[PDB]
């Protein structure tokens, strides 16, 4: 009991936490590994994601060597604040939380040879820039970059504890994604240069693919059916002027309702996405189906249609006959071009 | 070797008084500032502010922190900043700001042998930006960031951009959702008052709003509806059911476009360029339906007591006037 107490008090006599280990003598090498407990939700509107990790850092400090019956020393969180630790920060972090419920979720362990292990539980909210030009058929590689804030490449270097592929471990139930599919992650390290010097940056990229099934049922299928519905009016007799007029205008109103709702499910960006062009083309087709009838009606000589018992009657418009072929063909050709363009990337 | 560094730091901090600026009784201490911008996000028209994250560096010379015999720059623990003097620099138009503290407080203190001190901060600040949205969405914005000293005049402290025009980096790497940074400027000036001049630095941007989404979702559908209302002019005047249903449904469609864009677009309670065009298209479809009522009254009301002239006249004037309305509109706002 008293032996354990003596070593703790003896450790910090003469220690200076303001100086990194091996200052002016060598480079402080830090070995890091990350265990992701949950890859939280990805916010398209904010272009950011949340991640819950157990962050580990290991390094050697000769100033903390001790000899005693125990081989590993467990430090109180108060004592862990009196010892130099790496000032690791996330370059793309936006607002991270270091949990301290019900106690600070930190743990500092010292071995007899002066090797320190520093594990902390963190919730990191990091920005993931996205190119939404192929929405909703887009894929992203959300990064997670961290490194030293104040110590250059010549003072502190970071390394992965194991092979980089195996250093970042994601839990089997880690994924908490509703709209994306976590395909995997790539782990690498690099060098960045700033106005304050060269720094070592450890990067992890999480590769996400958006689920398309929701947009097919909510947006793509109703738009296709509405365009088919507008082209259905070509099979009505030309003498049903009120019927084809109401048919034409109400399909335009139906498309307008669908277009507005489909945009509300997309984050507020001012450039054109892939779904915007599909709706715009569908809008043009429904618009043209009503202009086509205006041309057909302009040549309808008689206001009475054919009767079952049988006088001369109006013939089937040659404009209507061609429209029954051109409009379904042109829309079908557009669909093949549209899907082959985006599903082959 | 390391033990020598420990005593040097103790000597520098022995007798150091953080209540006195460098060269307290002499010339003002020149503070050089440069900013590394990480990202700009949440450019809010409703709140008239933007949020940016930046690396904020400050340079000044403190002869009290000059050391000899060590050919290295002493990067110390970030907690040593509380034991030194730092400028009282604040952002004048800042509404809400904080310093990131994961995994530790993101600040640095680097000492140089001649006494130069580098004090860097990673700050996320929401800065106010008063926006003139009368030309929305065909508008440009100018959002600034004012840097001032709270309690020191130009006799005590001075500001300048270290590196000149290269002081601020990372501007060209920013990608805003609905904007596009055209240019940025650095301004150094003194705020002259009766008491004295106060140093101030100003970093400003010029934001140009992208128009692609508005063309596809606001202007083009409104143009198509207006053109559809002209179809009534090519239907026989006696087709009351066909012409009225076409006329009144385009009015309903325009109302649907206007009301739904009101909810989707940011709440900006004054007349903008987008509202004038939507209102203009609403009037045109209103007049197309009103045109038929005049035609129908002439033939049936005043009839017993030619109606193809009013339709022939409308088949030209309506396409001509709407194109003229577009010509005046797009020349005014562009």
């Amino acid at each position, epitope marked *: 009991t008293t032996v354990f107490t003596r070593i703790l008090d003896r450790l910090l006599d003469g220690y200076d936490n303001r100086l990194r280990p091996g200052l002016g003598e060598r480079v402080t090498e830090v070995k890091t590994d990350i265990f992701v407990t949950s890859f939280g939700p990805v916010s398209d509107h904010d272009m950011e994601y949340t991640i819950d990790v157990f962050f580990r850092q290991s390094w050697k400090d000769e100033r903390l060597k001790f000899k005693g019956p125990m081989t590993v020393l467990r430090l109180n969180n108060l004592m862990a604040s009196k010892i130099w630790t790496p000032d690791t920060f996330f370059h793309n972090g936006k607002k991270s939380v270091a949990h301290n419920m019900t106690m600070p979720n930190k743990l500092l362990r010292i071995t007899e040879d002066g090797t320190l292990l520093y594990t902390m539980r963190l919730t990191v909210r990091a920005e993931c820039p996205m*190119h939404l030009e192929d929405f909703p058929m887009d*894929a*992203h590689a959300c*990064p997670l*970059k961290f490194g030293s804030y104040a110590y250059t490449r010549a003072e502190v270097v970071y390394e992965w504890t194991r092979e980089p592929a195996r250093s970042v471990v994601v839990a089997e139930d880690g994924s908490r994604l509703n709209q994306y599919d976590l*395909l995997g992650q*790539t782990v690498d390290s690099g060098i960045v240069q700033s106005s304050t010097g060269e720094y070592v940056v450890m990067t992890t990229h999480f590769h996400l693919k958006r689920k398309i099934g929701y947009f097919v049922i909510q947006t793509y299928l109703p738009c296709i059916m509405t365009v088919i519905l507008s082209q259905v009016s070509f099979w009505l007799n030309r003498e049903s002027v009120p019927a084809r007029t109401v048919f034409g205008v109400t399909t335009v109103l139906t498309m307008t309702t669908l277009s507005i709702s489909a945009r509300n499910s997309l984050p507020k960006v001012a450039y054109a996405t892939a779904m915007d062009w599909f709706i715009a083309v569908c809008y043009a087709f429904v618009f043209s189906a009503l202009i086509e009838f205006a041309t057909v009606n302009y040549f309808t000589k008689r206001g009475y249609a054919w009767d079952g018992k049988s006088k001369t009657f109006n013939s089937v418009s040659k404009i209507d006959r061609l429209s029954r072929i051109a409009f379904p063909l042109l829309f079908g050709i557009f669909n093949l071009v549209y899907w082959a363009t985006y599903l082959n990337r | 070797n390391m033990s020598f560094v420990k005593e040097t730091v103790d000597k520098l901090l022995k007798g150091y008084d953080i209540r006195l600026r460098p060269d307290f009784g002499g010339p003002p201490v020149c503070v050089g500032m440069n900013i590394d911008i990480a990202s700009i996000d949440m450019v809010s028209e409703v709140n008239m502010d933007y949020t940016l994250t930046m690396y904020f560096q400050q340079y000044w010379r403190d002869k009290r922190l000059a050391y000899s015999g060590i050919p290295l720059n002493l990067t110390l623990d970030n907690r040593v900043a509380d034991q030194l003097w730092v400028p009282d620099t604040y952002f004048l138009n800042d509404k809400k700001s904080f310093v990131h503290g994961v995994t530790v407080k993101n600040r640095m203190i680097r000492l140089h042998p001649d006494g130069t001190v580098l004090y860097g901060l990673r700050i996320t600040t929401t800065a106010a930006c008063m926006m003139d949205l009368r030309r929305y969405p065909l508008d440009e914005q100018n959002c600034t960031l004012e840097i001032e000293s709270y309690g020191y005049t130009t006799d005590d402290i001075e500001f300048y951009w270290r590196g000149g025009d290269k002081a601020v980096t990372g501007v*060209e790497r920013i990608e805003l959702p609905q904007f596009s940074i055209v240019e940025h400027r650095l301004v150094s000036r003194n705020v002259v008052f009766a008491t004295g001049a106060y140093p101030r630095l100003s970093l400003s941007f010029r934001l140009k709003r992208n128009i692609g989404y508005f063309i596809l979702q606001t202007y083009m559908p409104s143009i198509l509806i207006t053109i559809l209302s002209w179809v009534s002019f090519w239907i026989n005047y006696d087709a009351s059911a066909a012409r009225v249903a076409l006329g009144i449904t385009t009015v309903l469609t325009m109302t649907t476009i206007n009301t739904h864009l009101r909810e989707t677009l940011p709440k900006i309670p004054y007349v903008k360029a987008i509202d004038m065009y939507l209102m203009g298209c609403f009037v045109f479809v209103f007049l197309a339906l009103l045109e038929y009522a005049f035609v129908n009254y002439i033939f049936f009301g005043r009839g017993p007591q030619d109606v193809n002239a009013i339709d022939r006249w409308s088949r030209i004037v309506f396409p001509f006037t709407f194109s003229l309305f577009n010509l005046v509109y797009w020349l005014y706002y562009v």
Partner: nanobody
Amino acid sequence: SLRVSCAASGRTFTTYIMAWFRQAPGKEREFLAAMDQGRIQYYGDSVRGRFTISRDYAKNSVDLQLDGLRPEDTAVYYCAAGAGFWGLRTASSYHYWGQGTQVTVSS
């Protein structure tokens, strides 16, 4: 000392990863260097510390600084740009490719 540039036209690559690749005759396509939006620089083992990659975000271009050239480096150099999906070192992750440049080293 040899410096190789790569001009990009028709699209701004501010938020794209611009990389350089080398293809030895008949062997394979080898990753050399890359730089993402955040200016993070990545290098291969065989060219770590030897080659320098720099991106001109204003001019939308990426430059490669070759120093200490060896006869092993005599190959075709390509300029690539992509989103780095499924690793920024794999050649299959890059879509926009330059026409290539031939570098011949004689000693």
